[PDB]
Amino acid sequence: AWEMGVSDPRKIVFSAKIGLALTIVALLIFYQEPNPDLSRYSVWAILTVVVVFEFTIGATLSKGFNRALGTLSAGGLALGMAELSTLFGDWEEIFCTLSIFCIGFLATFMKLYPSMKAYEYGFRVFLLTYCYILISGFRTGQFIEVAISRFLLIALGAGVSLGVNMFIYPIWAGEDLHNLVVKNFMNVATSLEGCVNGYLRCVYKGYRSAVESTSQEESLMSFAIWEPPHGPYKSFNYPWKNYVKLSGALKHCAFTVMALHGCILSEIQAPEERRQVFRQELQRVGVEGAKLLRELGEKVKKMEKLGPVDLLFEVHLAAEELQHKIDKKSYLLVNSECWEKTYESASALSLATFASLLIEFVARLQNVVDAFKELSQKANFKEPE
Amino acid sequence: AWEMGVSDPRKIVFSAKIGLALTIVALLIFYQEPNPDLSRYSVWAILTVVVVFEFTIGATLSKGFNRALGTLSAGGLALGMAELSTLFGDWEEIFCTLSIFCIGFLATFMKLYPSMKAYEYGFRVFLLTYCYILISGFRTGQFIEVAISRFLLIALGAGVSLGVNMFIYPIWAGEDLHNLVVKNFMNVATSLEGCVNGYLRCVYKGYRSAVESTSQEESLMSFAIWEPPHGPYKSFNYPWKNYVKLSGALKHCAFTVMALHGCILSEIQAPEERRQVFRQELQRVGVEGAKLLRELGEKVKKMEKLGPVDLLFEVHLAAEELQHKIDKKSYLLVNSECWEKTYESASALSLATFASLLIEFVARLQNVVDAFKELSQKANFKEPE
Ligand SMILES: CCCCCCCCCCCCCCCCCCC(=O)O[C@H](COC(=O)CCCCCCCCCCCCCCCCC)COP(=O)(O)O[C@H]1[C@H](O)[C@@H](O)[C@@H](OP(=O)(O)O)[C@@H](O)[C@H]1O
Ligand SMILES: CCCCCCCCCCCCCCCC(=O)O
Ligand SMILES: CCCCCCCCCCCCCCCC(=O)O
Numbered sequence: 001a002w003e004m005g006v007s008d009p010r011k012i013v014f015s016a017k018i019g020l021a022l023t024i025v026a027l028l029i030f031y032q033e034p035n036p037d038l039s040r041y042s043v044w045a046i047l048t049v050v051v052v053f054e055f056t057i058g059a060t061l062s063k064g065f066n067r068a069l070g071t072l073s074a075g076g077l078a079l080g081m082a083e084l085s086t087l088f089g090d091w092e093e094i095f096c097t098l099s100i101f102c103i104g105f106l107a108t109f110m111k112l113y114p115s116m117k118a119y120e121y122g123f124r125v126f127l128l129t130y131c132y133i134l135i136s137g138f139r140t141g142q143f144i145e146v147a148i149s150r151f152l153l154i155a156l157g158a159g160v161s162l163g164v165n166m167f168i169y170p171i172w173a174g175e176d177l178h179n180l181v182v183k184n185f186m187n188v189a190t191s192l193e194g195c196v197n198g199y200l201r202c203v204y205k206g207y208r209s210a211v212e213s214t215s216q217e218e219s220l221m222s223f224a225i226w227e228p229p230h231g232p233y234k235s236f237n238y239p240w241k242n243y244v245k246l247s248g249a250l251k252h253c254a255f256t257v258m259a260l261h262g263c264i265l266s267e268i269q270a271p272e273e274r275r276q277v278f279r280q281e282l283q284r285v286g287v288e289g290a291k292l293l294r295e296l297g298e299k300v301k302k303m304e305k306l307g308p309v310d311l312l313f314e315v316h317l318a319a320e321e322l323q324h325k326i327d328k329k330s331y332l333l334v335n336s337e338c339w340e341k342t343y344e345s346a347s348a349l350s351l352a353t354f355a356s357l358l359i360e361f362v363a364r365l366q367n368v369v370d371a372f373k374e375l376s377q378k379a380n381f382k383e384p385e
Numbered sequence: 386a387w388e389m390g391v392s393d394p395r396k397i398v399f400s401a402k403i404g405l406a407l408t409i410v411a412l413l414i415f416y417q418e419p420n421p422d423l424s425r426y427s428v429w430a431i432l433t434v435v436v437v438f439e440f441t442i443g444a445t446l447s448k449g450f451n452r453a454l455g456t457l458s459a460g461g462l463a464l465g466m467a468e469l470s471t472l473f474g475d476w477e478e479i480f481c482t483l484s485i486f487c488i489g490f491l492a493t494f495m496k497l498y499p500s501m502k503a504y505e506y507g508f509r510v511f512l513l514t515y516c517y518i519l520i521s522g523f524r525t526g527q528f529i530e531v532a533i534s535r536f537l538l539i540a541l542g543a544g545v546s547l548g549v550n551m552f553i554y555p556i557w558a559g560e561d562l563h564n565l566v567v568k569n570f571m572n573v574a575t576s577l578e579g580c581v582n583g584y585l586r587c588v589y590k591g592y593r594s595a596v597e598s599t600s601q602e603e604s605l606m607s608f609a610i611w612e613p614p615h616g617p618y619k620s621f622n623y624p625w626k627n628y629v630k631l632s633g634a635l636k637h638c639a640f641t642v643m644a645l646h647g648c649i650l651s652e653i654q655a656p657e658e659r660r661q662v663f664r665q666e667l668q669r670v671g672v673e674g675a676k677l678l679r680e681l682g683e684k685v686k687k688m689e690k691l692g693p694v695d696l697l698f699e700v701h702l703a704a705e706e707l708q709h710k711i712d713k714k715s716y717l718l719v720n721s722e723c724w725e726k727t728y729e730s731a732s733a734l735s736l737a738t739f740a741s742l743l744i745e746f747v748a749r750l751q752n753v754v755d756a757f758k759e760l761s762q763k764a765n766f767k768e769p770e
Binding site for chain 2: 011015029030031039051097104113139324340345346355364
């Protein structure tokens with residue numbers, strides 16, 4: 001509560017902004033000219049305020065657009081059907097209930113398509129609007145004024161919500177994707193160091209977050225294309241997709257770290273005295289990889305180009321040293337007596353797996369640098385000092 | 386559309402059930418005994434059906450409970466504050482709009498906790514009810530008479546929805562958990578066979594679904610605790626948690642299959658002619674593993690206990706034969722000339738990784754059998770024919 005608000009003060013301004021918009025609309029309702037008609041449906045502007053206030057600008061715009069589409073299409077259909085029903089003078093309510101059944105069937109079937117799972121909020125407003133408009137206009141006609149009057153209040157509430165959200169300490173979604181990339185870049189290096197240290201002893205959140213955030217970064221990329229230029233991101237079509245390409249290149253590397261972590265939890269393990277022979281070569285690779293990943297993260301954070309010096313020299317040298325060391329002592333991994341128990345042989349063979357997975361990670365490192373170079377070319381990154 | 390319906394005929398009955406409930410409510414609203422007030426709020430009963438109709442019984446029962454909690458607490462608070470406001474006679478609107486501000490702030494702050502992410506639908510009902518009751522009773526008193534009528538309409542709509550859902554071809558969430566476990570059991574075996582065949586060539590959906598459905602198996606289990614006894618599951622407290630334990634035991638095995646699939650996409654790979662030496666031993670393990678997993682899935686499906694014979698004899702024998710074969714021809718994995726380039730050495734060493742991962746999978750198989758035995762003990766499974 002108090003602790004969570006203290007740690008993140010972004011969540012205490014949003015609640016106050018929502019309260020401020022609600023207070024504004026409440027005052028505008030309470031202090032108004034005594035017009036008898038609207039006081040029976042003036043409660044709609046505050047429900048619109050409650051329903052259309054979202055955390056980010058891009059989400060607000062995109063979901064308001066979808067809700068408006070649904071409302072307007074449902075209203076058009078309801079008006080058309082109500083106009084048509086008059087022909088069947090003897091059976092008007094029968095026709096209305098038969099239209100309600102069919103529309104409810106169709107609207108419920110079309111929302112169960114798996115590819116429309118993220119738009120379930122826009123299929124509810126369609127059915128609500130159709131049913132409300134059809135049932136509320138049956139008596140005494142009055143179909144076309146039970147729509148304009150209740151749509152103008154919705155417009156007013158949406159305008160108030162948009163103004164308050166957009167003109168007072170706004171939160172953007174592109175700066176959230178920009179920060180998420182940097183966080184993943186640091187988590188992966190922490191995980192790698194932890195795994196190597198744990199194996200060499202006499203880790204999970206990092207690669208888990210680096211391998212389980214594809215949908216978060218895609219929702220964030222779908223919210224960031226609605227927002228206008230601001231701050232450092234001065235351009236009409238900012239390439240938000242190259243960030244996702246870099247994230248995928250990094251996740252491909254994180255898979256190997258996940259396999260290395262799985263190596264520790266294995267039922268079959270190698271003796272300690274055999275592990276201790278390769279300590280320094282195994283540790284140097286992890287040190288160099290962590291340094292490279294942190295350097296790439298810092299360069300991404302400040303929007304800077306790569307320098308002239310090669311970044312993969314040291315880790316490649318360490319990997320070649322590791323290969324030479326493995327070649328020199330390969331007689332500890334296999335047994336030559338049987339050349340032409342089983343648990344001991346499996347334990348002896350289980351160390352080559354760890355070494356080969358480390359070498360595979362080092363080999364995979366280069367796609368990330370290629371993707372970073374492409375992204376820094378697409379967006380105008382500053383020349384390094 | 387039509388293809389989706391023909392593939393899955395369960396989605397054509399849900400859509401007709403919703404339509405039928407809507408039609409019933411519409412008929413009751415269109416053929417009602419003339420009433421002065423009730424006729425102006427009849428529409429409140431046809432939107433409840435839209436809002437509370439869910440795919441499964443338990444979800445409908447868990448979410449209606451929470452929605453009722455939110456609505457009742459909001460109504461109580463609104464009535465209390467309306468009674469309280471009378472003391473400040475000079476400034477009534479100011480007090481009302483200040484309590485609106487405070488309630489909006491607190492309700493927005495309490496829903497941003499990370500542990501209340503799945504209950505966002507109940508924090509909206511609270512604010513909507515509070516604001517509606519406060520704003521609708523300001524003129525002409527009438528605070529305790531605008532609640533009972535609309536809550537009777539809400540109750541009627543919810544009752545119609547519940548009756549239609551529970552008395553016409555219901556869908557249960559425990560038969561969905563029970564089906565999901567069997568599906569994972571078959572997907573994993575298909576993935577394993579595909580991976581082995583692909584590596585020996587001269588796989589993704591299986592382990593992907595077996596490793597990414599933990600939340601589905603927890604949501605279905607939280608829905609299935611509300612449902613009364615029915616069909617084969619005759620008991621007051623059915624052990625739905627042993628299914629989750631078995632699923633986790635299977636996921637621990639699926640991790641190594643994912644690693645084996647990853648070994649195929651590596652940058653460093655071994656020559657084909659050297660792989661071909663171990664073909665039969667590599668294929669026998671996959672065949673036996675697939676057969677065992679399919680046997681376990683079939684026995685889970687029919688709710689039957691394991692027989693007296695040991696199910697892990699053949700796979701253990703195949704693993705031992707593979708280990709002997711590797712021990713006999715170990716000189717193709719290392720190079721002894723250097724005993725005291727790197728690309729070819731890494732390629733040669735990359736095959737021991739595959740063999741060791743296969744042996745680790747065989748080693749991990751036994752916890753799944755332990756979990757199955759425990760589950761078949763906890764629930765009364767039929768003795769084998
Ligand atoms: C012949 C014709 C030819 C064509 C010509 C053109 C003619 C077309 C004319 C078009 C005019 C049509 C306008 C018709 C007005 C009728 C609207 C009725 C309606 O919209 O229906 C009810 C109504 O309710 C009420 O009281 C009012 C509540 C307000 C609704 C606002 C919804 C959003 C509107 C669209 C988007 C706006 C923004 C657009 C951008 C604009 C920028 C300026 C909906 O309710 P709701 O959305 O608030 O839903 C609740 C639910 O009620 C809870 O219970 C919760 O439940 P839970 O999920 O459990 O938390 C949640 O679900 C929660 O969403
Ligand atoms: C806009 C006015 C109509 C609103 C209709 C949707 C209201 C959603 C609230 C659901 C409350 C469900 C309470 C269950 C009642 C019960 O049977 O005990
Ligand atoms: C937008 C409309 C939301 C639905 C709110 C309709 C009112 C239903 C809830 C009123 C229940 C009030 C009961 C309070 C009795 C008490 O606990 O003292």
